[PDB]
Amino acid sequence: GPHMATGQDRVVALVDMDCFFVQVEQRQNPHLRNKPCAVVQYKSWKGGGIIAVSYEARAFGVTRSMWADDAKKLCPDLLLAQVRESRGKANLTKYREASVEVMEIMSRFAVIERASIDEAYVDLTSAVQERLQKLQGQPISADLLPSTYIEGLPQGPTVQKEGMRKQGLFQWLDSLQIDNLTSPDLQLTVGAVIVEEMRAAIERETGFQCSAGISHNKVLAKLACGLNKPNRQTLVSHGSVPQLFSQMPIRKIRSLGGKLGASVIEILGIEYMGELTQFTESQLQSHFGEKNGSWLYAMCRGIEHDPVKPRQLPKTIGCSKNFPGKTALATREQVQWWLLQLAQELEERLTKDRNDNDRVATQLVVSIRVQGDKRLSSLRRCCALTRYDAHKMSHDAFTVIKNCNTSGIQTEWSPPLTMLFLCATKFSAS
DNA sequence: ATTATGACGCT
DNA sequence: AGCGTCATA
Ligand SMILES: [Mn+2]
Ligand SMILES: [Mn+2]
Ligand SMILES: [Mn+2]
To answer: What outcome follows a substitution of residue 189 to P?
Structure first.
């Protein structure tokens, strides 16, 4: 009774950009605006690989990881923007810099956790308490929530979609008790008001639109965010969880999209998140381990405790390139040339990072893939990173991998390399 | 022959 | 440490 924890202590939001790289290119090139559009890397192999798709183009069935030539079969008028190439490789700097624009705006409202190049979590608990004390028991007007959906509403005793959003919002606000400054539903609502303000600032100041989710933890906020994309935000209350989860495939929850989620389904013979509630914590721990078991037990009830980490900057800076099919590197001079190309991009990004962020990387990780190996990475080795010098870094990288060559004579490289990776890690203040 | 990343868990 | 898992454009 009075003692069951309900995972309602925090207000957490996740803000995620809409079709992010496409918006970055559409801002730069107005001819791409309001069009079926995609962003592609490379060109020669099957038109290049698509990595971002406008919502107009999704309507034709265009997706990420589609070759452009195949996307064009679905959408003949599809417009394309190409990722920059520098030093023989795709260079993502434009999108990393656009990301910083957005992250710096979000940071004006709260400490954020950068979770990808286009999204961040926000713990709004404190900001909500202050807006509530300002409010002075003042009801929250629907006009303060112009792009908010309330998940699960409307319900009970118009065929438009905006009409439905407003009906749900009205039912939600009508049920609220604004008299209680400790009420979780009220706290989420005020959180949503703040996130409207945040999203308006992002669009005003960058031209980019985004979606958001507001809930009591990161997993629910992430799930919420996707429910009404694009250019909308969604509030998932604690009370909405049993209905939401009763038909929610397990794989849709963050961390459960891979082998663990598949094992949950197979071992327990279930399909939906809600079905997990019928197992004891010990049962779940027995199948999935102590940590996963406790996490699942709480998660299926809408409860999760992972903190929003105060980290706005990536903690690693890496450069990677695949060499697929017949382009695999087979000579020493080839390997050394590409290690240098990667190291030069790495130096450029590291030197900028040092100036911007007052830190220095201290470890260099070198990774390669060899032909035949299914695994992402075949080998991973570290060495010291003592100077931001591309020639030193590439020479050092070569030194750490040079023994991988099964060749008898030194000039050939075998088995051929299908991936090179350089990553700077272990930052210290400077 | 999607690729280019980036965080965190295990032992 | 090195490997594996899961994730995002
Ligand atoms: Mn996005
Ligand atoms: Mn995202
Ligand atoms: Mn995506």
So the answer is: In XPV; likely pathogenic; loss of DNA-directed DNA polymerase activity; loss of function in translesion synthesis
Nearest residue by alpha-carbon distance to C1' of B7: A115
Record: fold of A1-18+89-249: Alpha-Beta Plaits (3.30.70)
> Which residues on adjacent β-strands are paired with residue A399?
none
Class of the CATH domain delimited by A19-88: alpha beta
A17 Cα–ligand 3 center, Å: 9
Q: How far is the CA of A293 from the C1' of B6 (A)?
A: 26
Q: Which residues surround ligand 2, an ion (CB under 5 A)?
A: A 16, 116, 118-119
Every domain range in chain A assigned CATH 3.40.1170.60: 19-88
Boundaries of CATH 1.10.150.20 in chain A? 250-307
Our measurement of the distance from residue A29's CA atom to the centroid of its chain's CA atoms, rounded to an integer in Å, reads 25
- Distance, in Å, from the CA atom of A369 to the CA atom of A217, rounded to the nearest integer, reads 37
Q: Which positions in strand B are less than 7 Å from the protein's CB atoms? A: 1-10
Provide CATH code, domain A250-307.
1.10.150.20
Q: What is the resolution of this structure in A?
A: 1.4
Q: Which fold has domain A308-430?
A: Dna Ligase; domain 1 (3.30.1490)
